[PDB]
Design an enzyme around this catalytic site. Structure first.
Site, short mmCIF file in Angstrom:
data_model
loop_
_atom_site.label_atom_id
_atom_site.label_comp_id
_atom_site.label_asym_id
_atom_site.label_seq_id
_atom_site.Cartn_x
_atom_site.Cartn_y
_atom_site.Cartn_z
N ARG B 44 -55.41 -9.74 17.03
CA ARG B 44 -54.61 -8.72 17.69
C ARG B 44 -53.52 -8.30 18.49
NH1 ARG B 44 -55.60 -7.27 22.71
NH2 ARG B 44 -56.04 -5.28 23.15
N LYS B 124 -71.93 -25.44 23.01
CA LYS B 124 -72.79 -24.12 23.99
C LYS B 124 -74.47 -23.65 22.96
CE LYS B 124 -70.90 -20.60 25.67
NZ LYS B 124 -70.02 -19.02 25.76
N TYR B 156 -74.05 -16.53 19.71
CA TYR B 156 -73.40 -17.65 18.20
C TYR B 156 -74.86 -17.31 18.08
CZ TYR B 156 -70.07 -21.06 20.86
OH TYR B 156 -68.99 -21.48 21.10
N1 LIG Z 1 -62.29 -23.72 22.87
C1 LIG Z 1 -62.43 -24.73 23.11
O1 LIG Z 1 -62.93 -25.70 23.44
C2 LIG Z 1 -64.12 -24.61 22.57
C3 LIG Z 1 -64.71 -25.22 22.20
C4 LIG Z 1 -65.64 -25.02 21.36
C5 LIG Z 1 -66.58 -23.90 20.76
N2 LIG Z 1 -65.44 -23.31 20.59
C6 LIG Z 1 -65.83 -21.66 20.39
O2 LIG Z 1 -64.56 -21.35 19.12
C7 LIG Z 1 -64.90 -20.02 19.40
C8 LIG Z 1 -63.06 -19.76 18.35
O3 LIG Z 1 -62.69 -19.87 19.60
P1 LIG Z 1 -61.48 -20.28 19.87
O4 LIG Z 1 -61.47 -21.08 21.15
O5 LIG Z 1 -60.81 -21.06 19.08
O6 LIG Z 1 -60.49 -19.23 20.34
P2 LIG Z 1 -59.78 -19.19 21.08
O7 LIG Z 1 -58.42 -20.01 20.92
O8 LIG Z 1 -59.45 -18.25 22.52
O9 LIG Z 1 -58.40 -17.84 20.26
C9 LIG Z 1 -59.01 -16.55 19.86
C10 LIG Z 1 -58.58 -16.21 19.11
O10 LIG Z 1 -59.13 -15.12 18.29
C11 LIG Z 1 -58.26 -13.50 18.89
N3 LIG Z 1 -58.78 -12.80 18.44
C12 LIG Z 1 -59.64 -12.21 20.29
N4 LIG Z 1 -60.26 -10.35 20.58
C13 LIG Z 1 -60.18 -10.49 18.79
C14 LIG Z 1 -59.51 -8.98 18.30
N5 LIG Z 1 -60.83 -8.33 18.86
N6 LIG Z 1 -59.07 -8.56 17.06
C15 LIG Z 1 -58.64 -9.73 16.46
N7 LIG Z 1 -58.61 -11.66 17.07
C16 LIG Z 1 -59.31 -11.41 18.33
C17 LIG Z 1 -57.02 -14.08 19.01
O11 LIG Z 1 -55.62 -13.49 19.11
P3 LIG Z 1 -55.41 -12.46 20.02
O12 LIG Z 1 -55.31 -12.92 21.54
O13 LIG Z 1 -54.46 -11.99 19.35
O14 LIG Z 1 -56.89 -11.26 20.11
C18 LIG Z 1 -56.87 -15.29 18.88
O15 LIG Z 1 -56.02 -15.82 17.87
C19 LIG Z 1 -65.92 -19.48 19.54
O16 LIG Z 1 -67.36 -18.88 20.25
C20 LIG Z 1 -65.64 -20.79 20.80
O17 LIG Z 1 -66.62 -20.50 22.16
C21 LIG Z 1 -63.95 -22.95 22.11
C1 LIG Z 2 -67.47 -29.84 28.82
C2 LIG Z 2 -67.10 -28.26 28.02
C3 LIG Z 2 -66.28 -27.14 29.33
C4 LIG Z 2 -68.42 -27.47 26.90
C5 LIG Z 2 -68.21 -26.54 26.66
C6 LIG Z 2 -66.91 -26.45 24.70
C7 LIG Z 2 -67.26 -25.11 24.59
C8 LIG Z 2 -65.96 -23.93 24.62
C9 LIG Z 2 -67.86 -24.60 23.64
C10 LIG Z 2 -68.69 -23.30 22.92
O1 LIG Z 2 -67.63 -22.53 23.23
O2 LIG Z 2 -69.56 -23.93 21.88
#
Ligand SMILES: NC(=O)c1ccc[n+]([C@@H]2O[C@H](COP(=O)([O-])OP(=O)(O)OC[C@H]3O[C@@H](n4cnc5c(N)ncnc54)[C@H](OP(=O)(O)O)[C@@H]3O)[C@@H](O)[C@H]2O)c1
Ligand SMILES: CC(C)=CCC/C(C)=C/C(=O)O
Ligand SMILES: NC(=O)c1ccc[n+]([C@@H]2O[C@H](COP(=O)([O-])OP(=O)(O)OC[C@H]3O[C@@H](n4cnc5c(N)ncnc54)[C@H](OP(=O)(O)O)[C@@H]3O)[C@@H](O)[C@H]2O)c1
Ligand SMILES: CC(C)=CCC/C(C)=C/C(=O)O
EC number: 1.3.1.122
Lengths: 366, 366
Positions: B44, B124, B156
């Site tokens: 974005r 999650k 999810y």
């Molecule tokens: N981070 C972790 O530790 C973790 C762990 C396990 C699972 N996950 C899951 O992985 C998934 C992805 O999350 P993430 O942590 O990888 O994300 P993130 O690092 O916060 O990155 C989010 C991305 O999405 C973009 N974005 C957000 N809103 C948008 C919109 N309206 N239009 C276009 N782009 C948009 C952001 O760009 P802009 O800032 O420009 O909007 C950024 O590139 C989620 O379901 C999260 O719960 C994350």
């Molecule tokens: C110990 C923690 C903080 C776990 C959550 C990892 C995440 C961000 C999971 C998910 O977004 O599904």
């Protein structure tokens, strides 16, 4: 017929043991690294029937007796790799040391193609010994191979010291393997947890009683790990044949974690009986005490199910289950082995069941 | 010059994110499966300078807006694989659903060589959502991919449902990836634990204060796991190219466990400051509260060290660290992926340090 050719020649010391019995199988598979292997299998008892049905040259020998070991092993001029997977069954440092010294003193002068000595110890290296008097502060986990020796009389220290000295003097390579809790099938092991829990379950079933978990709360809910005997065999064979693994201390586990809580449910299902899990507020009870008068019951079971005849104290180690069920915080790391290129693993839940299946195929358990 | 040939063409949705930024690197390596890859990267905000220095075709687009997404993505006729690694940054089910629907509605009618959609969710799935009102009983662990959905409004669930419906209708393959806690380097992530702890450490160092652990006792001593962003990228690329991984739900972690206790010591050493670990009897304190008035301090740090300019709330997510440090019992299993032939792993302690090193190379942290 002309003498059979082999690429490698194993001396497996402790061939009836929980890992030795696996090595006797794994070494003889067609695709095993370093093969085709010839296998000499050493143990103290007469060759059991189950082992006589394997292509293993059995050598009955008390390796704690130097003259007997010389007499029995010094004719084996073709040995290329030693797999030391034995212990006396007590923590006596000198008796265990003597056994390993005797092997090396008997083989090294006589096996001109000898390459490598594999020494199996274990994760007790990191937390101490079973002797009740020894009040010692273990290392924190996950256990890694850079952790220094504890200040305890652990016979593992003596075995390593002998290994280093004797391989060093004679231009041989060495490996030390530190398995986690072993999941295996030998009915002749002094520490076979799966067999032990299967025997308990069998007795419960025989007596129309539930599979009652006797352990601590902590050991029910904590993360635990183990190693399949076949994976230990594979890890030892890897170190014996692969240049990258040589002269290394290496942990050996399945690469995952489990909980006894989940294993228990599986155990009950495998025997088609009800489980009573851990009950909140209950203290651990001694499974050794629960089973102390069951020898005749086991005999009756063996007869009624036509099992391979075993004595209860030889197939099961209830004292060992008691230690497992008051242990926690013993996870070991496989990163060093993985970083050296060993990517062998098992699903521990599947490994546990495979051991049950295998013990039933062998008719050790019903 | 004649149009450049590519074997595969990725749409990475969330290219500035903690996994998207890794995909932007990994997809362009010469030996990456499915390569040579062309990469369209969607986010974005305007393309940051650090991303403009990568061979990625950036597409600024608000994917929550359907007409904008059609206008921006419908010209991309050559897309072969979609990597959806984005979320809106709240748990709003419909806004997150709308984003993913918009991608598929814009691409599927226009990309005649489209093969596969990779959907990234996370662990999650197994334990619930962050919204404070939601009082829910999580699954016990280790988490495996056969566990049923919890009765909670987890976005999810909606994303999966859309994935299944739309791939099914259009003869596309799908994969759902459930990463553990991510170890990564993006300064634009809403949930980057390494960056968050590095910023804390930097501020501590700036103020001549110790690195004081603010978390719970349990989260200090428990087993934890995580996933390197590069491994998540590799796992998603594996599912995109390998027939064995197709139409599967798959966890993604480093394959080991660690403890925050050990990570903390490493963090202190990396910043050359004293640590105060967990103190027996102390309750968790809010790191979000500790850092609430530090924005100007971070600005001063950025200036004094000539860092890439970041706003404190954008590079760090102190609220997310607070959740990490009151969590336990969240270990996930990699057996399904391993059994399907994915043997990628990382040493988590080394992964954590590699993320620090990388954030320093990029000048995001001193
Ligand atoms: N981070 C972790 O530790 C973790 C762990 C396990 C699972 N996950 C899951 O992985 C998934 C992805 O999350 P993430 O942590 O990888 O994300 P993130 O690092 O916060 O990155 C989010 C991305 O999405 C973009 N974005 C957000 N809103 C948008 C919109 N309206 N239009 C276009 N782009 C948009 C952001 O760009 P802009 O800032 O420009 O909007 C950024 O590139 C989620 O379901 C999260 O719960 C994350
Ligand atoms: C110990 C923690 C903080 C776990 C959550 C990892 C995440 C961000 C999971 C998910 O977004 O599904
Ligand atoms: N079992 C586990 O869960 C486990 C886990 C980690 C590490 N370890 C370690 O692995 C090492 C080997 O133990 P293990 O459990 O594999 O052993 P085990 O299953 O009890 O087998 C011991 C073997 O050594 C033989 N043996 C004993 N004394 C002998 C002697 N005097 N002469 C010749 N053979 C003799 C036994 O044969 P006989 O019965 O005929 O004497 C048997 O073949 C030990 O250091 C142990 O602590 C074991
Ligand atoms: C939980 C238990 C019972 C661990 C001990 C595993 C063994 C037998 C280790 C060793 O002998 O080094």
């Amino acid at each position: 017929g002309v003498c059979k050719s082999y690429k490698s020649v194993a001396l497996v010391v402790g061939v009836t043991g929980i890992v030795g019995s696996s090595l006797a199988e794994v070494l003889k598979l067609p695709d095993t690294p370093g093969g085709p292997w010839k296998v000499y299998g050493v143990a103290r008892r007469p060759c059991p029937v189950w082992l006589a049905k394997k292509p293993v040259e059995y050598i009955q020998c008390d390796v704690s007796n130097n003259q007997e070991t010389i007499s029995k092993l010094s004719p084996l001029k073709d040995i290329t790799h030693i797999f030391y997977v034995s212990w006396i069954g007590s923590e006596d440092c000198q008796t265990n040391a003597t056994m390993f010294k005797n092997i090396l003193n008997s083989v090294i002068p006589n096996a001109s193609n000898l390459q490598h000595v594999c020494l199996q110890t274990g994760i007790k290296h990191y937390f101490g010994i079973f002797e009740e008097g020894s009040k010692v502060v273990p290392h924190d986990s996950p256990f890694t191979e850079d952790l220094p020796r504890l200040n305890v009389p652990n016979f593992y220290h003596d075995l390593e010291d002998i290994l280093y000295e004797e391989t060093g003097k004679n231009n041989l390579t060495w490996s030390v393997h530190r398995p986690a809790l072993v999941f295996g099938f030998s009915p002749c092991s002094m520490m076979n947890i799966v067999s032990t829990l299967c025997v308990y379950a069998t007795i419960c079933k025989h007596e129309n009683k539930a599979l009652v978990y006797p352990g601590s709360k902590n050991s029910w809910n904590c993360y635990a790990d183990a190693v399949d005997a076949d994976l230990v065999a594979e890890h030892e064979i890897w170190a014996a044949v692969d240049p990258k693994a040589k002269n290394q201390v290496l942990n050996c586990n399945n690469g995952d974690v489990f909980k006894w809580k989940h294993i228990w449910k599986k155990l009950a299902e495998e025997f088609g009986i009800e489980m009573v899990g851990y009950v909140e507020g209950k203290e651990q009870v001694s499974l050794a005490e629960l089973m102390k008068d069951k020898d005749q019951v086991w005999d009756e079971i063996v007869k009624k199910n036509n099992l391979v005849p075993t004595k209860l104290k030889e197939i099961a180690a209830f004292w060992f289950a008691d230690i497992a069920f008051c242990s926690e915080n013993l996870i070991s790391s496989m990163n060093k082995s993985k970083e050296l290129g060993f990517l062998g693993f098992r699903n521990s839940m599947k490994s546990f069941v495979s051991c049950i299946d295998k013990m039933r195929d062998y008719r050790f358990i019903p």
